Design a protein around this ligand. Structure first.
Ligand SMILES: O=[P-]([O-])[O-]
Lengths: 268, 268, 268
């Protein structure tokens, strides 16, 4: 009925009545799909996969064996509310990845964008927000309410503490504990993680203009290397966004203005 | 015969003859339950769960997908003896948790008390002892013969080496390696882990009176921050428990006396 | 039919036409075995195991539940070529281990020898080579193209960066990140991992004579404890193996010469 006739579902799998399976979807054996799951066109699901909850999965995703998507979260305040997982298009979700449903107190939604790679045993906790083209290496873990920007790389066996915000194009080294906000374009390394410079080797593969590197490093220099306080290093970078009007300096500025709304602070 | 009438087992799951299944038990699809397994009343077991060995599971437990309970341990000295896993009541056992059976050389039993939370990918090795109301965050690992007191918190991606004793109300930070014994009420962080004062945030969360806090803190000053040796600190703390009859100073000295029977020592 | 008649396969498992299964093989329920898999005599495969790709498994292996062997690797330059996994005899492959197929760019093969122990959640990436009698503790991770000699120990929650070479009889401590090559017989620990003398307990457990220990201790001092550059020590170490003809100094020397053909260097 609600299963598209072009979908290929292995007979051994259990598809709960009410699940929406799009065109050209493939589902392997020994899967369990909940009655509120929606799976977009072209998505490929291997064997031994569990998908439940109010979960929306987009187009052309690949979900490998022993993955768990949309499951009850690990927050002790969750009370069975119809919270959601929302996954975009063309994501790679490897073996034993866990993506838990959100909480009402945290915004109701755990959200993942497009073109992401979640390696083996990646955990995405309740109410996380992952942008586009991110990579979380093996055993990576995001705490509750964690926000990732675009083109973020989380190294292997690294954890981001709850509520922390990771700016776009950040690289977190392997075996690193992130306990504060990480401004965009910077390398985070250590336990707890500290700024290790800019992600220059990564920004160059993205195709950044040479004099856009200098504008970004100026904001990094003002924030970390000029010996100024948070508010004073924030006034200067915000002034550069209006005088020189560099799109990356404004992004680097927008992050610090949003991090000022909370008592987390930034890594230093 | 041994399966209660009110239990609901999914027809795809495999239950060997001899498995004792209590009332109001729910077993999801694609499970394997061994012939020497006992499931207490009200326990909920999701899909894709493996439970074998001589395993006793109490009441109102929740065991999520891809968990393994009672399986052959990773000790090379084990030779197939009918050793046991014992799990208490109201435990939350999340995805991909492994709980292995004991060894005859270690005491024959891997034991877990009540009201514990074992997060995703938690490992409990052979002959471990876990008390009540403990929390092991994602990827936490207990080596063989490890003992956890009550209300212990092990941070994410942390490891307790074999035979080590973790006192009650201890908080182990994330990505920390515990190599020696941790006295009760203490925060331990690092690899190898070192003490960082009292777990004041946990104690005030559990309704500790202000007099009990200053009593425990004084016992901490005697142990670490007074220059007195381990033998001298044990003498004074034992004299405090006998004179003042404080229930938590007693727990503090008792741990030190039991740790004195071994050569590991305490963290410092 | 290439399934041997003495093999015992649970009817719920999916054995695709083309899989070759030797005599006395046992396969538990809910397994998926691909059409290009070969399984050798006496090998025990528990439940919920996925084995696919062009994968040859030797004799008397023990593969536990939720393991994945031969799956598409995480290298984003891979393009579905028929690459291989080769696993030797008498290996212990614990729960949720992942072993990925090779890449055409890196030698086409992921290879594992005999008598190895891969503990829970071990990851063996594409094109890795593991020798004999190695132990990888819980949550250990080998990046792409990593080589392990014989009798190697990787501590729990430790990661070996891609292309790095680990010499024989090395013990990598728990929660360590190996970013360069590790000469044989060396204890490596830290993040990044640095050398801390010889694996004396490992060598003595394997019956190393004291004359062998003194020669290895002597080769260690030349490389690390005499201020000699890499070119100097490598030439002097190669002179010791030619003169004294100590079989372990030669292994020590051969590793340094093979590592010199690359630019990763050695830990220090
Ligand atoms: O990096 P992991 O040992 O905390």
């Amino acid at each position: 009925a609600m299963i598209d006739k072009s979908a290929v579902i292995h007979p051994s799998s259990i598809i709960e009545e009410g699940a929406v399976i799009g065109a050209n979807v493939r589902i392997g054996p020994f899967c369990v799909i909940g009655s509120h799951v929606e799976i977009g066109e072209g998505t490929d699901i291997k064997s031994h996969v569990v998908i439940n909850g109010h979960t929306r999965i987009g187009r052309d995703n690949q979900i490998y064996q022993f993955a768990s998507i949309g499951e009850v979260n690990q927050d002790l305040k969750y009370r069975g509310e119809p919270t959601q997982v929302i996954i975009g298009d063309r994501n790679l979700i490897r073996e034993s990845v866990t993506i838990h449903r959100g909480t009402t107190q945290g915004g109701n939604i755990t959200k993942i964008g497009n073109d992401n790679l979640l390696m083996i045993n990646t955990h995405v906790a309740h109410d996380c927000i992952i942008g586009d083209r991110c990579i979380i290496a093996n055993n990576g873990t995001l705490g509750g309410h964690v926000t990732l920007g675009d083109y973020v790389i989380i190294g292997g066996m690294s954890a981001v503490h709850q509520f922390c915000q990771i700016g776009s194009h950040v690289m977190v080294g392997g075996c690193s504990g992130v306990a504060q906000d990480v401004p965009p374009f910077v390398i985070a390394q250590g336990n707890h993680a500290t700024p290790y410079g800019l992600n220059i080797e990564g920004l160059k593969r993205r195709g950044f203009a040479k004099e856009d590197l200098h504008a970004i490093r100026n904001a990094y220099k003002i924030l970390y290397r000029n010996g100024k306080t948070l508010e004073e290093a924030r006034e200067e970078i915000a002034q550069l966004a209006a005088d020189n009007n560099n799109q990356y300096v404004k992004i680097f500025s927008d992050f610090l203005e949003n991090s000022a709304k909370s008592n987390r602070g930034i890594i230093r």
